[PDB]
Design a binder for this molecule. Structure first.
Ligand SMILES: NCCc1c[nH]c2ccc(O)cc12
Length: 373
């Protein structure tokens, strides 16, 4: 049925982010950090144009064979080249599983109201993956061994792939009934660009904040190392709550208004992080940041599907490749550019710049109220 497709997409995204987050504490123990995101950004539009040619089931199932190969390559690798190869393979997989899975969800839940909350649930998949990533990784790392986390995650990826092969049955290539509108015509749409830009700036704010916040906490607050890991918890829990609630709330409120308010709340929250003196001062603003990132993503993915349905041809592979490029731009240029700006003009000014950009971008979501057909 359809809820099994929703579960498959949720599980793919959850395992993808659990891997992405169990890898990050092991790596130091620069290019490797941005490698997955940039390779996924490169191979997003290709998958977008491919799902319209072979269908959704096959490029979503290749996303389990690529993520499984990446996972096992992480567990039995020592060299730096092999870790880079493993992270690039994870990037290609994730591209396959995010783009093809969101396309499948939008193709199956073909109703504007239902698509909202199923996108919300699939997105909360990423929050549940990031949130349960580090603890699982650590406990399985030290209580069993250093190859343990990745081999157990590989077993989980295999079980998810078994569910995939039993639900989707990717045996045969099935092209779409109608040829989807080209990628350039989509990219010339002022509304698809506004949606992608709102997702891009929200996630770039959060992706520049995550790595820059610990480097500032150890300098201003003299925080211990456990504090650095705990100070970012409100973001993930709040993103989980925000996505799961606003998938259902945004269509009653209006997706344009939910996106506008999410942008303004991300802006204000990020403008209000540098004013915190102690760790208890980074609970409320980080909560606002994560809550509003969810408020924006759970409102702007269904709108992507809707904007394609209303104006262009009903093929969702490319437009969700565009949405996933907007996602990945932030996580690719986040660490590097954020560290560069913080190393040059400081962390408070970086946060003020990001907040100003988000607040000034917010009024552009007004143009999503009633776009013409
Ligand atoms: N839009 C998903 C981003 C998101 C939610 N919570 C997070 C915590 C850290 C991070 O880099 C990113 C996130």
């Amino acid at each position: 049925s359809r809820k099994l497709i929703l579960f498959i997409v949720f599980l793919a995204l959850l395992l993808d982010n659990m891997l992405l987050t169990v890898v990050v504490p092991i790596i130091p123990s620069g290019l490797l950090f941005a490698s997955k995101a940039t390779v996924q950004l490169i191979t997003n539009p290709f998958i977008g144009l491919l799902t319209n040619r072979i269908g959704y089931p096959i490029p979503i199932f290749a996303g389990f064979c690529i993520m499984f190969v990446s996972t096992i390559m992480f567990a039995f690798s020592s060299s730096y080249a092999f870790l880079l190869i493993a992270r690039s393979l994870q990037g290609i997989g994730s591209s396959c599983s995010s783009v093809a899975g969101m396309g499948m969800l939008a193709s199956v839940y073909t109703d504007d109201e239902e698509r909202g909350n199923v996108m919300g649930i699939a997105l909360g998949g990423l929050a549940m993956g990031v949130l349960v990533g580090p603890p699982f990784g650590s406990v399985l790392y030290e209580f069993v061994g250093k190859t343990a986390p990745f081999l157990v995650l590989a077993a989980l990826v295999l079980l998810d792939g078994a569910i995939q092969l039993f639900v989707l049955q990717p045996s045969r290539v099935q092209p779409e009934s109608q040829k989807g509108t080209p990628l350039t015509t989509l990219l010339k749409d002022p509304y698809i660009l506004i949606a992608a830009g709102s997702i891009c700036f929200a996630n770039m704010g959060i992706a520049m904040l995550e790595p820059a916040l610990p480097i500032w906490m150890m300098e201003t607050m003299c925080s211990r190392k456990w504090q650095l890991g705990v100070a970012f918890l409100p973001a993930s829990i709040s993103y989980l709550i925000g996505t799961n609630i606003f998938g259902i709330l945004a269509h009653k409120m209006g997706r344009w208004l939910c996106a506008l308010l999410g942008m303004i709340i991300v802006g204000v929250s990020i403008l209000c992080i540098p004013f915190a003196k102690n760790i208890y001062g980074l609970i409320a603003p980080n909560f606002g940041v994560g809550f509003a990132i969810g408020m924006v993503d759970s409102s702007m993915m269904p709108i992507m599907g809707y904007l394609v349905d209303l104006r262009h041809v009903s093929v969702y592979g490319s437009v969700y490749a565009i949405a996933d490029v907007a996602f990945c731009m932030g996580y690719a240029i986040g660490p590097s550019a954020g560290g560069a700006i913080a190393k040059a003009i400081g962390f408070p000014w970086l946060m003020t710049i990001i907040g100003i950009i988000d607040i000034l971008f917010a009024p552009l979501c007004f143009f999503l109220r009633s776009p013409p057909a």
